[PDB]
Design a protein around this ligand. Structure first.
Ligand SMILES: O=C(O)CNC(=O)C(=O)O
Ligand SMILES: [Mg+2]
Ligand code: NI
Ligand SMILES: [Zn+2]
Length: 331
């Protein structure tokens, strides 16, 4: 078995290998990359996502989210308080202000220490989940707005045509902005490109050990666990590396820098934080190997998780017994 310790793998495709996205995903899996739950892909040196980022300041962040924490430093939840709209140029200035800017630090490890020590005492503002793309239309390789759609994959594999669309999302971050422990909707893959700015640190649990994380989360967030049998679908809970190590949960960590892709694999739990002002783009995708994960994915039916239009068909076709209850949660 390839990669039996489930380490995060890093790949350096040539320009020739960068032509066929599906084939390269299947290659990475042949080498065991999926066992980690996360892989890094460094694009060939000849490749670029677009010519410059000089003209992005007028993009609107309609609903910036202030991420307010409750709990203890290593075990906390976050809620999102909606703020007034602001442009990317306004948000960048805010991120660079004395109140919100990255503190002095020695290296990524010192910054990670300061994040875990101090996150809960501040409420950073995240411009998350903005529909759109920063890839130039002329970029033909690994352009996240030009991927094969998950609806077309389901149709190719299963023969059933379904409604729905699949488009990318932009994330504008600042120091301490945080993504909570989650898997993707319907345990899909994700791909994330860091367009510009400061790094993003990731933590990941191997898919084969995901249920270990779930059992710890039920112990650590006991009211949330009684409220919902899949409460990590709410995307609000954080658990530090120190706490994971104390409870014997297998995980790995890696820092993504500007110009790099990350791929998360089906049922790979992940969480992380931004080091400073940055912009990422991400989208879900599927392969044939995903279908069985989609059929087994947990679902939130308590009403909190509330998701896209396109998840309806995936539930209806892959999980018909769950459909009725899940849809009640969505309505
Ligand atoms: O970058 C973020 O805030 C969160 N991204 C992801 O969870 C992803 O790409 O799967
Ligand atoms: Mg602009
Ligand atoms: Ni994700
Ligand atoms: Zn729920």
């Amino acid at each position: 078995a390839q990669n039996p310790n489930c380490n995060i793998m890093i790949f350096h495709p040539t320009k020739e290998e960068f032509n066929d996205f599906d084939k390269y995903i299947a290659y990475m899996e042949s080498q065991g990359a999926h066992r980690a739950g996360l892989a890094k892909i460094i694009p060939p040196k000849e490749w670029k996502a677009r010519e410059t980022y000089d003209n992005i300041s007028e993009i609107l962040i309609a609903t910036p989210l202030q991420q307010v924490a409750s709990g203890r430093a290593g075990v906390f939840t976050q809620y999102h308080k909606k703020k007034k709209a602001m442009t990317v140029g306004e948000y960048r200035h805010l991120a660079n202000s004395k109140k919100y800017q990255t503190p002095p630090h020695q290296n990524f490890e010192d910054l990670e220490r300061k994040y875990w020590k101090n996150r809960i005492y501040n409420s950073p503002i995240y411009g998350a989940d903005i529909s759109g793309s920063l890839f130039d239309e002329n970029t033909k390789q690994w352009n996240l707005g030009h991927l094969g759609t998950i609806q077309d994959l389901l149709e190719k594999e299963c023969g059933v045509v379904i409604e729905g669309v699949n488009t990318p999302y932009l994330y504008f971050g600042m120091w301490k902005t945080t993504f909570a422990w989650h898997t993707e909707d319907m345990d899909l893959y994700s791909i994330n490109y860091l367009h510009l700015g400061e790094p993003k640190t990731w933590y990941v649990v191997p898919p084969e050990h995901g249920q270990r994380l779930e059992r710890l989360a039920r112990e650590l967030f006991p009211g949330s666990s009684r409220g919902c049998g899949a409460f990590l679908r709410h995307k609000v809970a954080l658990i530090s590396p120190t706490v994971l190590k104390e409870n014997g949960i297998p995980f790995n960590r890696i820092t993504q820098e500007a110009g790099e892709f990350m791929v998360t694999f089906p049922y790979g739990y992940h969480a992380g934080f931004n080091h400073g002002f940055n912009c990422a783009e991400a989208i879900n995708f599927a392969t044939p190997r995903w279908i069985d994960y989609g059929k087994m994915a947990s679902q939130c039916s308590c009403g909190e998780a509330r998701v896209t239009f396109s998840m309806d068909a995936f539930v209806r076709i892959l999980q018909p017994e769950r459909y009725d209850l899940w849809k009640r949660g969505q309505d």
